[PDB]
Design a protein around this nucleic acid. Structure first.
Ligand SMILES: CN[C@@H]1[C@@H](O[C@H]2O[C@H](CO)[C@@H](N)[C@H](O)[C@H]2O)O[C@H]2C[C@@H](N)[C@@H](O[C@H]3[C@H](O)[C@@H](O)[C@H](N)C[C@@H]3N)O[C@@H]2[C@@H]1O
Ligand SMILES: [K+]
Ligand SMILES: [K+]
Ligand SMILES: [K+]
Ligand SMILES: [K+]
Ligand SMILES: [K+]
Ligand SMILES: [K+]
Ligand SMILES: [K+]
Ligand SMILES: [K+]
Ligand SMILES: [K+]
Ligand SMILES: [K+]
Ligand SMILES: [K+]
Ligand SMILES: [Mg+2]
Ligand SMILES: [Mg+2]
Ligand SMILES: [Mg+2]
Ligand SMILES: [Mg+2]
Ligand SMILES: [Mg+2]
Ligand SMILES: [Mg+2]
Ligand SMILES: [Mg+2]
Ligand SMILES: [Mg+2]
Ligand SMILES: [Mg+2]
Ligand SMILES: [Mg+2]
Ligand SMILES: [Mg+2]
Ligand SMILES: [Mg+2]
Ligand SMILES: [Mg+2]
Ligand SMILES: [Mg+2]
Ligand SMILES: [Mg+2]
Ligand SMILES: [Mg+2]
Ligand SMILES: [Mg+2]
Ligand SMILES: [Mg+2]
Ligand SMILES: [Mg+2]
Ligand SMILES: [Mg+2]
Ligand SMILES: [Mg+2]
Ligand SMILES: [Mg+2]
Ligand SMILES: [Mg+2]
Ligand SMILES: [Mg+2]
Ligand SMILES: [Mg+2]
Ligand SMILES: [Mg+2]
Ligand SMILES: [Mg+2]
Ligand SMILES: [Mg+2]
Ligand SMILES: [Mg+2]
Ligand SMILES: [Mg+2]
Ligand SMILES: [Mg+2]
Ligand SMILES: [Mg+2]
Ligand SMILES: [Mg+2]
Ligand SMILES: [Mg+2]
Ligand SMILES: [Mg+2]
Ligand SMILES: [Mg+2]
Ligand SMILES: [Mg+2]
Ligand SMILES: [Mg+2]
Ligand SMILES: [Mg+2]
Ligand SMILES: [Mg+2]
Ligand SMILES: [Mg+2]
Ligand SMILES: [Mg+2]
Ligand SMILES: [Mg+2]
Ligand SMILES: [Mg+2]
Ligand SMILES: [Mg+2]
Ligand SMILES: [Mg+2]
Ligand SMILES: [Mg+2]
Ligand SMILES: [Mg+2]
Ligand SMILES: [Mg+2]
Ligand SMILES: [Mg+2]
Ligand SMILES: [Mg+2]
Ligand SMILES: [Mg+2]
Ligand SMILES: [Mg+2]
Ligand SMILES: [Mg+2]
Ligand SMILES: [Mg+2]
Ligand SMILES: [Mg+2]
Ligand SMILES: [Mg+2]
Ligand SMILES: [Mg+2]
Ligand SMILES: [Mg+2]
Ligand SMILES: [Mg+2]
Ligand SMILES: [Mg+2]
Ligand SMILES: [Mg+2]
Ligand SMILES: [Mg+2]
Ligand SMILES: [Mg+2]
Ligand SMILES: [Mg+2]
Ligand SMILES: [Mg+2]
Ligand SMILES: [Mg+2]
Ligand SMILES: [Mg+2]
Ligand SMILES: [Mg+2]
Ligand SMILES: [Mg+2]
Ligand SMILES: [Mg+2]
Ligand SMILES: [Mg+2]
Ligand SMILES: [Mg+2]
Ligand SMILES: [Mg+2]
Ligand SMILES: [Mg+2]
Ligand SMILES: [Mg+2]
Ligand SMILES: [Mg+2]
Ligand SMILES: [Zn+2]
Lengths: 124, 138, 99, 208, 83, 104
RNA sequence: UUCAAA
RNA sequence: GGCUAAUCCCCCAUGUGGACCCGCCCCUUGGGGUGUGUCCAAAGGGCUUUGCCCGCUUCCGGAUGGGCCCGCGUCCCAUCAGCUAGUUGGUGGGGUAAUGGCCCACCAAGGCGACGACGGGUAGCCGGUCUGAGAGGAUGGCCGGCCACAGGGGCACUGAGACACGGGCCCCACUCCUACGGGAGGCAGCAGUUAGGAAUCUUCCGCAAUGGGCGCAAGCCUGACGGAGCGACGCCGCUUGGAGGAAGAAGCCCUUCGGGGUGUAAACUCCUGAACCCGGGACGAAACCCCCGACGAGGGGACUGACGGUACCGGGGUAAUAGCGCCGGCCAACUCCGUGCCAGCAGCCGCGGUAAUACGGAGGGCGCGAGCGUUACCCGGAUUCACUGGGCGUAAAGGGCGUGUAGGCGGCCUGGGGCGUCCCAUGUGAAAGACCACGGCUCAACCGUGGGGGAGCGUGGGAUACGCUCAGGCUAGACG
């Protein structure tokens, strides 16, 4: 553009669109569950990934993914959300923090135990 | 019309050299002449004559290149491998004395105009002054 | 509860009252002085005025009017009274007026 | 606490024998002595052409393990040296050097640096008088580093210091085996060091 | 009513004051009209108490009411010795 | 120093007052290219002296009315109505740029 | 038909 | 309803002096001075007693603080283009410390806007902070400066000052006593409670220090403040040992069953002693006061520590917590087993359908270490809004085409001005911060002292090439 134009028009700033609008950008947010079904992955994948329609304290109803290999989540279980895409199953943009509220940590987990909220095996 | 006279000359020069011409004329303007004095005194152009083409004041500029070379492309080296206009109309560039650019670790000049006359960067930094940064060359 | 800074509220009321009075008095004579000057009665026109200049200045003595406030009030009064006696007047009493 | 575990193990991950144990790391058995390949059940296997990063990563670890310092500490010094005037690469070096726990070993009062550290953290050292238990503590030029009166007569200090007599020291250090004194004359130049490290790389590692 | 006083610029258990001219209504450690000295209540340094004597002798000439301690220090530096 | 500015009377339709338009040249803060920018002040014409077109020197004065804190100090050059043109024409330009276009 | 795989 | 004191209120007087009208000078917006006329003062109390002290009155000036006004700079939406009757200006007037449509009466048509008015949305601003090569972007908690508000909405009173957080009145909502007629109340002060939330503290000690109020002083009040307490939330320092020690225990894992790993690692030998115990134990505090002197300089002496019996010092003295992430490529680090497009992983490219260095476990390895990870947000990389520093034939991107308004941009020569531009001098740029050098805590973090810069703007003086403007001339552009 001519300089005049810039002086006239001016350059335009680019705003960033959040990928996790489960409000206040708050690191985490809690909600109660509703549906706790399983879903099929996008191509080229297959399995029954565990999801859950959560009713957040931010007034929203989003579907959060349940990591780990086993869970104890039912109807009105309260749980903490934390954002994290789930590449496959679209629509899912948040994760369920395990080990917080009615979402127990995975069992016998010995590796990356910090995630999946499992205490440290006392080791005999 | 002829939008920007100086930027024109700096080009007629630039072009005339890429084809390796003897000289090249340009419309006569004192300011242009003063600019040439600098190009002359710096070893960029063998010099300039005041020839009058068609009965209209001109400025025959005599260009200078290098020596023939080895291998493919024996074309001489340019003395002026760069001459870019700076302060152009519709965005004038004015510099204080302590903001006068060191043109390529000093191997090039920077014809700038001050109220003490048209001088090179060194010249005006010496005289301690600033002005319209007419252009650069190297 | 209680703040014995009520003695302050108590007092303002007692003051508010004293001021309100001095003021009303000033305003009343001022008006009353202009009334007569604007009737060509240069006699008690000044007498009442001169007797209001003091009421004003005095009010300023303490913390009722204070400063330029009294100054102004007086200026405004002597001005009206002079140019209002511009109807055969002739400041007889002289009063607060350099004739 | 600065590391604290298997040492004559890193010795053999940097391919250079880091005398990190003093004696034994000096005499036939430094682990590097007959077992130069890396630890773990994969050491002897051929090695893949290390990446530009891979390299600077070791060349740093090497230098850092030599002084047994923590990354947390290592960074600050470097960042401080990066600011200080002059060739950052050396200035970094002569700074790691100015560490008490180091100058102590450099003076010999202790064999290795790990031991040299324990001496300081236990009060067995004095800088121009007055005790000092700060391994990091900066040793400026002219400062004298002696052994506490109350400890000059200790089972260890003896042997270590007796072992000195004769053995010289850096063109920046000066001893006094007598009363067990020593003085920090000059700040070692890059030249004064024989470090098996190309500091130039460790610069290029943070210059990342 | 301006005063010559101290403004604590130390740290926890490491006090350091600044003798200053200032309207008594400002907060202890706020903007002041001028600094005319600095006292170190613990003499951690050979020079624990310096004080511009001229400026002092001046602010006093126009009001600068010195707090008690302010006065003491100004005194112990000959602000008031009239030989 | 009470700020003194120079401008052109573009309005005399007020009682004991005049609208003075003042221009100010300068390099643009980011793109450099120098630009003109103007502002008009309502100056005090005590004895309806200065008339439309004149060029006057306005001086920072004591408040006279909401929006009007300048008195006309003196006259530099007279009635050059050519300047007033650049102005009136611009305002007259505004006529368009509305809801149903306008005229060039 | 889908997903790979040279 | 009645009685009463004063530094409470009032009248008269004296008046250095100050206030007002008019006239006249000098100044120049309402500044200063004159000459007639007029107007205005004041408590008293204490004594080491006709002498001092704490006060009082009218002035002038100083110092500090504050009103008001002006130039310039300060967010998004043009799918907000017209806005405006106290509106714009006038003449009187009221109000105030003071200018002003600040409010009122009457008069005049005016004022603002694409250089973005008006409407809508978002937001306390700044010193600075983070980031960045810089330009720039993002921020404004803590500390310091302005501002605004004190349940919501209005008011004025007192007073040097307020339109008052812990003052007053009224209206609305709510809470609590009520004899149901009425009343009382505002933690966005320190703590604390409850609610909302992913989340943010003790209903602590003290007035010793500094600071503020009143007081002649003693002294009193001070959740300002100085200290503790809880929280890895952050920064800095520090320990969980040091030196020996097998051609290399066992157990684990791997194996072409030769052998290889963990491993100098451990066991074990000696060595120093975090913890803990004993004893000593402070800086921060010397003034106010009292005495000598003169209630002055100057000298002398007495009080006084929350922190804290703590820090620190001396002596004694036990070997005395480690985790978390990761290892297909980017990206530093590999193998065995179990799984069989299942279970699961996943920042991007991607892994798992019977041999998986990618899933889960194990051995081993890499990174960092009282921390290590994950999530959210800011800058960078991103010359990916390109001013520095991009592009548009076919990648996204030339308006379908003109005409011409505003605007941007203007050929050669000479003069004047000096707006832009440039130069010198000077004022300012508070403190903290950043940078440099010294110095204090054993280092450091932290803190102290000093110093050097700096954009911007003000003022005085100067330059005139280029741009601008005024005034002439030209013919090479353009038109005829
Ligand atoms: C006796 N109080 C202790 C204090 O003692 C020290 O400072 C006092 C200051 O007056 C001295 N009087 C005392 O003699 C001295 O020893 O040191 C602090 C150190 C601080 N990081 C924290 O640690 C805690 C951690 O923060 C926490 O995470 C952990 N779980 C427990 C730790 N104690 O709380 C303690 C606690 O307040
Ligand atoms: K219109
Ligand atoms: K009564
Ligand atoms: K005064
Ligand atoms: K002011
Ligand atoms: K008016
Ligand atoms: K901002
Ligand atoms: K299998
Ligand atoms: K695995
Ligand atoms: K980014
Ligand atoms: K098109
Ligand atoms: K069209
Ligand atoms: Mg969220
Ligand atoms: Mg697949
Ligand atoms: Mg994510
Ligand atoms: Mg060129
Ligand atoms: Mg440029
Ligand atoms: Mg009282
Ligand atoms: Mg009446
Ligand atoms: Mg450096
Ligand atoms: Mg007016
Ligand atoms: Mg089919
Ligand atoms: Mg498939
Ligand atoms: Mg293939
Ligand atoms: Mg009665
Ligand atoms: Mg008198
Ligand atoms: Mg007199
Ligand atoms: Mg007069
Ligand atoms: Mg009297
Ligand atoms: Mg009397
Ligand atoms: Mg009285
Ligand atoms: Mg109005
Ligand atoms: Mg008035
Ligand atoms: Mg008026
Ligand atoms: Mg807000
Ligand atoms: Mg950049
Ligand atoms: Mg900023
Ligand atoms: Mg807060
Ligand atoms: Mg603040
Ligand atoms: Mg409010
Ligand atoms: Mg509230
Ligand atoms: Mg209210
Ligand atoms: Mg209110
Ligand atoms: Mg008062
Ligand atoms: Mg009042
Ligand atoms: Mg109040
Ligand atoms: Mg109120
Ligand atoms: Mg207020
Ligand atoms: Mg309150
Ligand atoms: Mg509270
Ligand atoms: Mg809750
Ligand atoms: Mg706290
Ligand atoms: Mg106190
Ligand atoms: Mg006090
Ligand atoms: Mg109380
Ligand atoms: Mg208390
Ligand atoms: Mg506090
Ligand atoms: Mg060992
Ligand atoms: Mg022992
Ligand atoms: Mg003390
Ligand atoms: Mg002391
Ligand atoms: Mg006391
Ligand atoms: Mg005496
Ligand atoms: Mg004394
Ligand atoms: Mg790798
Ligand atoms: Mg994983
Ligand atoms: Mg299958
Ligand atoms: Mg199958
Ligand atoms: Mg991997
Ligand atoms: Mg730490
Ligand atoms: Mg960018
Ligand atoms: Mg560009
Ligand atoms: Mg740009
Ligand atoms: Mg591009
Ligand atoms: Mg196409
Ligand atoms: Mg295209
Ligand atoms: Mg086209
Ligand atoms: Mg045009
Ligand atoms: Mg035009
Ligand atoms: Mg031109
Ligand atoms: Mg033009
Ligand atoms: Mg000219
Ligand atoms: Mg100029
Ligand atoms: Mg300056
Ligand atoms: Mg500063
Ligand atoms: Mg030091
Ligand atoms: Mg400093
Ligand atoms: Mg000329
Ligand atoms: Mg002409
Ligand atoms: Zn070794």
């Amino acid at each position: 553009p001519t300089i005049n134009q810039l002086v006239r028009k001016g350059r335009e700033k680019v705003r960033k669109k959040s990928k996790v609008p489960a409000l206040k950008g708050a690191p985490f947010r809690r909600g109660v569950c509703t549906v706790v079904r399983t879903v099929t992955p996008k191509k080229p994948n297959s399995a029954l990934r565990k999801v859950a329609k959560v009713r957040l304290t931010s007034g929203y109803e989003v579907t959060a993914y349940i990591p780990g290999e086993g869970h104890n989540l039912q109807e009105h279980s309260v749980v903490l959300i934390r954002g994290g895409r789930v590449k496959d199953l679209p629509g899912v943009r948040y994760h369920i923090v395990r080990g917080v509220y009615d979402a127990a940590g995975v069992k016998d987990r010995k590796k990356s135990r910090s995630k999946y909220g499992t205490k440290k095996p006392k080791e005999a | 019309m002829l939008t920007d006279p100086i930027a024109d000359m700096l080009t007629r020069i630039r072009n005339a050299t890429r084809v390796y011409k003897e000289s090249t004329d340009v419309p006569a303007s004192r300011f242009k002449e003063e600019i040439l004095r600098i190009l002359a005194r710096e070893g960029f152009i063998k010099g300039y004559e005041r020839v009058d083409v068609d009965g209209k004041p001109y400025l025959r500029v005599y260009l200078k290149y290098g020596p023939r070379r080895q291998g493919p492309d024996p074309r001489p080296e340019q003395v002026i491998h760069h001459i870019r206009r700076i302060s152009k109309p519709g965005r004038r560039v004015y510099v204080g004395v302590k903001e006068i650019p060191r043109v390529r670790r000093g191997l090039g000049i920077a014809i700038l105009s001050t109220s003490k006359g048209v001088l090179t960067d060194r010249e005006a930094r010496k005289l301690g002054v600033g002005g319209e940064l007419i252009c650069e060359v190297w | 509860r209680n703040l014995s800074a009520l003695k302050r509220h108590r007092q303002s009321l007692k003051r508010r009252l004293r001021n309100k009075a001095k003021k009303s008095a000033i305003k009343t004579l001022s008006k009353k002085a202009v009334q007569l000057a604007q009737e060509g009665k240069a006699e008690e026109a000044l007498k009442i005025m001169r007797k209001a200049e003091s009421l004003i200045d005095k009010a300023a003595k303490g913390s009722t009017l204070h400063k330029n406030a009294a100054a102004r009030r007086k200026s405004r009064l002597m001005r009206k009274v002079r140019q209002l006696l511009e109807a055969a007047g002739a400041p007889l009493i002289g009063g607060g007026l350099s004739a | 606490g600065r590391y604290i575990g298997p040492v004559c193990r890193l010795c053999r991950r940097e391919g250079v024998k880091l005398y990190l144990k003093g004696e034994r790391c000096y005499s036939p058995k430094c682990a590097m002595e007959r077992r130069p390949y890396p630890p773990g059940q994969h050491g002897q296997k051929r090695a893949r052409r290390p990446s530009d990063y891979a390299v600077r990563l070791r060349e740093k670890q090497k230098l850092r393990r030599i002084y047994g310092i923590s990354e947390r500490q290592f960074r600050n010094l470097f960042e401080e040296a990066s600011k200080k005037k002059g060739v950052t690469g050396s200035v970094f070096l002569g700074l790691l050097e100015s560490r008490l726990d180091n100058v102590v070993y450099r003076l010999g009062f202790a064999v290795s640096r790990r031991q040299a550290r324990q001496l300081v953290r236990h009060g067995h050292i004095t800088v121009n008088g007055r005790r000092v238990d700060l391994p990091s503590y900066r040793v400026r030029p002219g400062d004298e580093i002696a052994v506490a009166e109350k400890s000059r007569n200790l089972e260890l200090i003896r042997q270590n210091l007796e072992a000195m007599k004769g053995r010289k020291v850096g063109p920046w250090l000066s001893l006094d085996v007598e009363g067990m004194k020593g003085k920090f004359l000059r700040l070692p130049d890059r030249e004064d060091l024989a470090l098996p490290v190309n500091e130039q790389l460790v610069i290029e590692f943070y210059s990342r | 009513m301006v005063k010559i006083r101290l403004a604590r610029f130390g740290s926890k258990h490491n006090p350091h004051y600044r003798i200053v001219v200032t309207d008594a209504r400002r907060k202890r450690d706020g903007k002041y009209i001028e600094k005319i000295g600095y006292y170190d209540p613990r003499k951690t340094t050979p020079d624990w108490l310096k004080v511009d004597v001229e400026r002092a002798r001046y602010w006093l000439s126009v009001g600068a009411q010195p707090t008690d301690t302010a006065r003491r220090l100004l005194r112990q530096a000959g602000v008031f010795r009239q030989e | 120093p009470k700020k003194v500015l120079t401008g052109v009377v573009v309005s005399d339709k007020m009682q004991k007052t005049v609208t003075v338009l003042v221009e100010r040249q300068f390099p643009h803060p980011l793109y450099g290219k120098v630009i003109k920018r103007s502002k008009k002040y309502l100056a005090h014409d005590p004895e309806e002296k200065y008339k439309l077109g004149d060029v006057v020197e306005i001086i920072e004065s004591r408040p006279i009315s909401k929006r009007k804190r300048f008195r006309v100090l003196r006259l530099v050059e007279s009635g050059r109505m050519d300047l007033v043109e650049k102005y009136l024409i611009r305002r007259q330009n505004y006529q368009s740029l509305s809801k149903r276009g306008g005229k060039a």
